[PDB]
Design a protein around this ligand. Structure first.
Ligand SMILES: *[C@@H]1O[C@H](CO[C@H]2O[C@H](C)[C@@H](O)[C@@H](O)[C@@H]2O)[C@@H](O[C@@H]2O[C@H](CO)[C@@H](O[C@@H]3O[C@H](CO[C@H]4O[C@H](CO)[C@@H](O)[C@H](O)[C@@H]4O[C@@H]4O[C@H](CO)[C@@H](O[C@@H]5O[C@H](CO)[C@H](O)[C@H](O)[C@H]5O)[C@H](O)[C@H]4NC(C)=O)[C@@H](O)[C@H](O[C@H]4O[C@H](CO)[C@@H](O)[C@H](O)[C@@H]4O[C@@H]4O[C@H](CO)[C@@H](O)[C@H](O)[C@H]4NC(C)=O)[C@@H]3O)[C@H](O)[C@H]2NC(C)=O)[C@H](O)[C@H]1NC(C)=O
Ligand SMILES: *[C@@H]1O[C@H](CO[C@H]2O[C@H](C)[C@@H](O)[C@@H](O)[C@@H]2O)[C@@H](O[C@@H]2O[C@H](CO)[C@@H](O[C@@H]3O[C@H](CO[C@H]4O[C@H](CO)[C@@H](O)[C@H](O)[C@@H]4O[C@@H]4O[C@H](CO)[C@@H](O[C@@H]5O[C@H](CO)[C@H](O)[C@H](O)[C@H]5O)[C@H](O)[C@H]4NC(C)=O)[C@@H](O)[C@H](O[C@H]4O[C@H](CO)[C@@H](O)[C@H](O)[C@@H]4O[C@@H]4O[C@H](CO)[C@@H](O)[C@H](O)[C@H]4NC(C)=O)[C@@H]3O)[C@H](O)[C@H]2NC(C)=O)[C@H](O)[C@H]1NC(C)=O
Lengths: 206, 206
């Protein structure tokens, strides 16, 4: 049997309104010893129940047990440890897996929107670019809007560790050549630990 | 004790000057059976020796043996399979791993360069970019120059699968606000399978 600890998604922890949850998944459990026992420890204290919640799935030719511990935004953002310690008679010694966020001192993301190259106006569709650079830790959420209306045709590169020991990423919104010339305003919205309201938005137009 | 097959570097294969290789790395080789036997087959036919060249390395609490095979550019680009067959007494059945490039026909990369943003002119350093979009396969090499001479302070993201079923990547060069302002001419040089001379080079200046 194998244990896998998963962290919360950034938007969920940067929005008060949302629900961060550190998820523990046990694979290869088996039919002969399906008896999995979970021990959730925040930072050192067994948060015992908190509001932990398992269940058994009958997979492969084996079982799959998942439990969830609902993470408290502030505890997350201050860098607690989260330990999922799983007992199961088959498994000789109980597997412990511990998680947190990237140990360091957080840096505010510089957000610059870039309009399309002259040459790309030769094309039928143009590329709108925003750079998010010199941020830390690499937990971020970047989106695009045309108004009070969210957009579709965008793609975001994985956070690349730059030279500073800070991170960078580019995000590419592709639009019809026309709209951009019909003087529309497209915004890139960045969400990060170290942003003023955990949010910033830079805009683009013709 | 398994095997991993590693492909040639996209600059090594796009340049005939340079000698590409396929690297077969066998890990978890345990002490009492150190006898690794690499068998190298090109596509259909065993290139037997060709110019295959291993060596033992005593790691962890185990062994690491790696065998390198040279490639002919042409073969690689014509999409031949390369087959590494590992032997080691302990390992009951022989490990036959096989590699090759991606299937599909090349798309010529669109190399556009973007200037620093006005919002970034506020900084003692600015960021030059080239967006390299709509290519295929993912294998490419972006490098940066300023005159007759190469530069240091660039960082290029991994190739991200875009909607076309083609790729993009951005590459970010960081220079002094001064150098940019003195009116110097920076170059983005993209090397890709489907470009005229396996090379193209888009330029920036102030
Ligand atoms: C018996 O069968 C089962 C199931 O089999 C399927 O297929 C059969 C054909 C079919 O018949 C059925 O049985 C069934 O469909 C087998 O199970 C699989 O077992 C393997 C291991 O053998 C597991 O592999 C691991 O996977 C990890 C990734 O897992 C995520 O992705 C996979 C693939 O997308 C998903 O399946 C999986 O569910 C995970 O998705 C994420 O899940 C979480 C929790 O649900 C989501 O959480 C969100 O949380 C927020 C909180 O706010 C919110 O609540 C959201 O709503 C939630 O959704 C999250 O959203 C999901 N993610 C996304 C993007 O959506 C791998 O990371 C893991 O890899 C690490 O470990 C292995 C092992 O050591 C290493 O080899 C590997 O290299 C890597 O190691 C190191 O890890 C670091 C962290 O990743 C990494 O940074 C580091 O670089 C790395 N080191 C190196 C050197 O690379 C591993 O691959 C499968 O997950 C599991 N499948 C399932 C479906 O459970 C079983 O094996 C089989 N038994 C047999 C064959 O014997
Ligand atoms: C005992 O210890 C050793 C080492 O331990 C370290 O730490 C100790 C504390 C210390 O005391 C020392 O012992 C030591 O420092 C353990 O070994 C490790 O074992 C793991 C697991 O077995 C291996 O994991 C695999 O790693 C692959 C990535 O490997 C690259 O990165 C690592 C990290 O940087 C490098 O170390 C490694 O060398 C590889 O770098 C690339 O290497 C090639 C060949 O050297 C380079 O080639 C260039 O070629 C050009 C050609 O022109 C030119 O010649 C250049 O000069 C050459 O250099 C290349 O440059 C390097 N790359 C770069 C960027 O520089 C992973 O990809 C691999 O992942 C696959 O498998 C896992 C497991 O199943 C999956 O989870 C994962 O998803 C992935 O699967 C992929 O799936 C696809 C779908 O099926 C499939 O299609 C695809 O084919 C498949 N991918 C592959 C590759 O098959 C995997 O994680 C480590 O590599 C190994 N580390 C070392 C240093 O050897 C050992 O386990 C341990 N024993 C124990 C614990 O019992």
């Amino acid at each position: 049997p194998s244990v896998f600890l998963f962290p919360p998604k950034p938007k969920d922890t940067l929005m008060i309104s949302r629900t961060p949850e550190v998820t523990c998944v046990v694979v290869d459990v088996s039919h002969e010893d399906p008896q999995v026992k979970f021990n959730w420890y925040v930072d050192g204290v067994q948060v015992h129940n908190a509001k932990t919640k398992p269940r058994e799935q009958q997979y492969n030719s084996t079982y799959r047990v998942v439990s969830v511990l609902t993470v408290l935004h502030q505890n997350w953002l201050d860098g607690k440890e989260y330990k999922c310690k799983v007992s199961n008679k088959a498994l000789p010694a109980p597997i412990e897996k511990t998680i947190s966020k990237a140990k360091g001192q957080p840096r505010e993301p510089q957000v610059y929107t870039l309009p399309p190259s002259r040459e790309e106006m030769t094309k039928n569709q143009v590329s709108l670019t925003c750079l998010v650079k010199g941020f830390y830790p690499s937990d971020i959420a970047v989106e695009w809007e045309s108004n009070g209306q969210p957009e579709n045709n965008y793609k975001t590169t994985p956070p690349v560790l730059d030279s500073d020991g800070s991170f960078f990423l580019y995000s590419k919104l592709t639009v019809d050549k026309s709209r951009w010339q019909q003087g529309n305003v497209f915004s890139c919205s960045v969400m990060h630990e170290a942003l003023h309201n955990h949010y910033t938005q830079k805009s683009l137009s013709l």
